[PDB]
Design an enzyme around this catalytic site. Structure first.
Site, PDB file in Angstrom:
ATOM      1  N   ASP A 108       2.290   2.638  -4.195  1.00 45.34           N
ATOM      2  CA  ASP A 108       1.196   2.672  -5.372  1.00 45.34           C
ATOM      3  C   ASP A 108       1.919   3.672  -6.711  1.00 45.34           C
ATOM      4  OD1 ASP A 108       1.407   5.339  -4.106  1.00 45.34           O
ATOM      5  OD2 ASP A 108      -0.942   5.595  -3.969  1.00 45.34           O
ATOM      6  N   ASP A 186       3.985  16.670   3.194  1.00 45.92           N
ATOM      7  CA  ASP A 186       4.177  17.198   1.766  1.00 45.92           C
ATOM      8  C   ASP A 186       3.864  18.698   1.718  1.00 45.92           C
ATOM      9  OD1 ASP A 186       1.331  16.499   2.024  1.00 45.92           O
ATOM     10  OD2 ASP A 186       1.256  15.769  -0.009  1.00 45.92           O
TER      11      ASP A 186
HETATM   12  C1  UDM Z   1      -0.542  11.668  -5.159  1.00 47.90           C
HETATM   13  C2  UDM Z   1      -0.183  12.307  -3.613  1.00 47.90           C
HETATM   14  O1  UDM Z   1       0.121  13.525  -3.496  1.00 47.90           O
HETATM   15  N1  UDM Z   1      -0.047  11.438  -2.669  1.00 47.90           N
HETATM   16  C3  UDM Z   1       0.116  12.047  -1.218  1.00 47.90           C
HETATM   17  C4  UDM Z   1       1.319  11.276  -0.541  1.00 47.90           C
HETATM   18  O2  UDM Z   1       2.494  11.147  -1.529  1.00 47.90           O
HETATM   19  C5  UDM Z   1       1.657  11.750   0.535  1.00 47.90           C
HETATM   20  O3  UDM Z   1       2.803  11.005   1.442  1.00 47.90           O
HETATM   21  C6  UDM Z   1       0.647  12.012   1.780  1.00 47.90           C
HETATM   22  C7  UDM Z   1       1.057  13.002   2.869  1.00 47.90           C
HETATM   23  O4  UDM Z   1      -0.025  13.354   3.743  1.00 47.90           O
HETATM   24  O5  UDM Z   1      -0.469  12.752   0.923  1.00 47.90           O
HETATM   25  C8  UDM Z   1      -0.906  12.140  -0.231  1.00 47.90           C
HETATM   26  C9  UDM Z   1      -1.565  10.677   0.022  1.00 47.90           C
HETATM   27  P1  UDM Z   1      -2.408   9.652  -0.907  1.00 47.90           P
HETATM   28  O6  UDM Z   1      -1.589   9.166  -1.974  1.00 47.90           O
HETATM   29  O7  UDM Z   1      -3.690  10.183  -1.126  1.00 47.90           O
HETATM   30  O8  UDM Z   1      -2.690   8.158  -0.116  1.00 47.90           O
HETATM   31  P2  UDM Z   1      -1.682   6.830   0.296  1.00 47.90           P
HETATM   32  O9  UDM Z   1      -1.086   6.469  -1.144  1.00 47.90           O
HETATM   33  O10 UDM Z   1      -2.760   5.870   0.736  1.00 47.90           O
HETATM   34  O11 UDM Z   1      -0.702   7.271   1.318  1.00 47.90           O
HETATM   35  C10 UDM Z   1       0.496   7.527   1.344  1.00 47.90           C
HETATM   36  C11 UDM Z   1       1.484   6.625   1.629  1.00 47.90           C
HETATM   37  O12 UDM Z   1       1.268   6.430   2.860  1.00 47.90           O
HETATM   38  C12 UDM Z   1       1.495   4.752   3.503  1.00 47.90           C
HETATM   39  N2  UDM Z   1       0.643   4.977   4.737  1.00 47.90           N
HETATM   40  C13 UDM Z   1      -0.932   4.922   4.573  1.00 47.90           C
HETATM   41  C14 UDM Z   1      -1.571   4.654   5.908  1.00 47.90           C
HETATM   42  C15 UDM Z   1      -1.076   4.654   6.727  1.00 47.90           C
HETATM   43  O13 UDM Z   1      -1.719   4.400   8.122  1.00 47.90           O
HETATM   44  N3  UDM Z   1       0.297   4.437   7.054  1.00 47.90           N
HETATM   45  C16 UDM Z   1       1.220   4.597   5.925  1.00 47.90           C
HETATM   46  O14 UDM Z   1       2.394   4.602   6.024  1.00 47.90           O
HETATM   47  C17 UDM Z   1       0.883   4.185   2.272  1.00 47.90           C
HETATM   48  O15 UDM Z   1       1.451   2.942   2.449  1.00 47.90           O
HETATM   49  C18 UDM Z   1       1.763   4.972   1.146  1.00 47.90           C
HETATM   50  O16 UDM Z   1       2.998   4.655   0.693  1.00 47.90           O
HETATM   51 MN    MN Z   2      -1.264   7.406  -3.018  1.00 44.76          MN
END
Ligand code: UDM
Ligand code: MN
Length: 342
Positions: A108, A186
């Site tokens: 994203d 993170d």
């Molecule tokens: C803006 C921000 O600071 N975002 C951070 C993100 O960079 C970080 O890695 C995560 C660590 O906890 O905290 C939030 C998540 P946040 O940004 O809120 O949420 P998401 O985009 O849905 O997920 C982060 C990443 O994890 C992946 N994903 C999601 C669900 C799953 O089952 N498996 C998987 O690999 C998604 O494809 C995406 O590349």
């Molecule tokens: Mn995100």
């Protein structure tokens, strides 16, 4: 040196927006191979990635089982899955493909026109300075009215790990993998046991911007902060610039001399735009309460991770306020972060 772009995906078909921008701006397929690691198994997302053919390499996280979470984490299964995927994907990049470094980009994130140029220019700095542990495209305080549009080339060091489009060396994965956490990777990175006093390079204007309003979390942080981060659109030829100023020795002498040599102003005067002849000032804070109060008054992020403020360096948060350069800083006697500042 080949620097792969590792794209992390799951179940959002909008990974198309991310890949389209990466492929449009990529200057060399050989120097920047794109590896898309997909977790979850979402069929439509898989078909979207597959449609790019040989332009990318599509790999699939193998273990789609549910994870046994600890008693305090029933609501956080998704964060455990993110951590598991990161460990597997980074292992593929550094153990299977055996690359020397990688830039991690979540599905994203939309990249800026000079995203590749930026990492190409900063990779040698990361290789040469062990006091640095990453290069990030993200400015945590990068909202439009907080950044200087006339200085798209300006870079900084930060003690606050930003992630969101970041370069790491295989050497760092060697250190992190044996103790990789079950969840919240993170914030785990942001702890002193992991950071060990190291900094990341970050820009005045972000080279990534997230559009993921809907994801694992609740849209709160996105709606109140992330959606306002400005994506750079002016191409800066970083590989043609002299980035020696970012070396620890030079930076800790010159940037600190600049901050503490600047005139001090009370927060109220900065707020109301008094004394405009002072184009660069310092606003001093003396404790957790004053830091939070002053950050909020000037519109910058006020949360702390392991006692470190967003984009802070030696406790200093640097930004623009109504056109003026402001350094929200602790007394020059500063000597380390206190994790109890929550
Ligand atoms: C803006 C921000 O600071 N975002 C951070 C993100 O960079 C970080 O890695 C995560 C660590 O906890 O905290 C939030 C998540 P946040 O940004 O809120 O949420 P998401 O985009 O849905 O997920 C982060 C990443 O994890 C992946 N994903 C999601 C669900 C799953 O089952 N498996 C998987 O690999 C998604 O494809 C995406 O590349
Ligand atoms: Mn995100």
């Amino acid at each position: 040196a080949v620097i792969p772009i590792l794209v992390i995906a799951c179940d959002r078909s909008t990974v198309r927006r991310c890949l389209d921008k990466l492929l449009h701006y990529r200057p060399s397929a050989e120097l920047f191979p794109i590896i898309v690691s997909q977790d979850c198994g979402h069929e439509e997302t898989a078909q979207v990635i597959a449609s790019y053919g040989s332009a990318v390499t599509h790999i699939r996280q193998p273990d789609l089982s549910n994870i046994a979470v600890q008693p305090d984490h029933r609501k956080f299964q998704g964060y455990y899955k993110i951590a598991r995927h990161y460990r597997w994907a980074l292992g593929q990049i550094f153990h299977n493909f055996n690359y020397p470094a990688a830039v991690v980009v979540e599905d994203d994130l939309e990249v800026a026109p000079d995203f590749f140029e930026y990492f190409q220019a900063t990779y040698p700095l990361l290789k040469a300075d062990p006091s640095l542990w990453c290069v990030s495209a993200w400015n945590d305080n990068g909202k439009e009215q907080m950044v200087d549009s006339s200085k798209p080339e300006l870079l900084y060091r930060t003690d606050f790990f930003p992630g969101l489009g970041w370069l790491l060396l295989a050497e760092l994965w060697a250190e992190l993998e044996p103790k990789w956490p079950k969840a919240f990777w993170d914030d785990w990175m942001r702890r002193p046991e992991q950071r060990k006093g190291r900094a990341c390079v970050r820009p005045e204007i972000s080279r990534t911007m997230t559009f993921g309003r809907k994801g694992v979390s609740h849209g709160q942080f996105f709606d109140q902060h992330l959606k306002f981060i400005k994506l750079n659109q002016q191409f800066v030829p970083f590989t043609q610039l002299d980035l020696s100023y970012l070396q620890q020795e030079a930076y800790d002498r010159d940037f600190l001399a600049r901050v503490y040599g600047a005139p001090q102003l009370q927060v109220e005067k900065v707020r109301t735009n008094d004394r405009k002849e002072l184009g660069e000032v310092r606003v001093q804070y003396t404790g957790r309460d004053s830091f939070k109060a002053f950050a909020k008054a000037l519109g910058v992020m006020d949360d702390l991770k392991s006692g470190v403020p967003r984009a802070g360096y030696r406790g200093i948060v640097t930004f623009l306020f109504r056109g003026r350069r402001v350094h929200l800083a602790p007394p020059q006697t500063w000597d380390g972060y206190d994790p109890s500042w929550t």
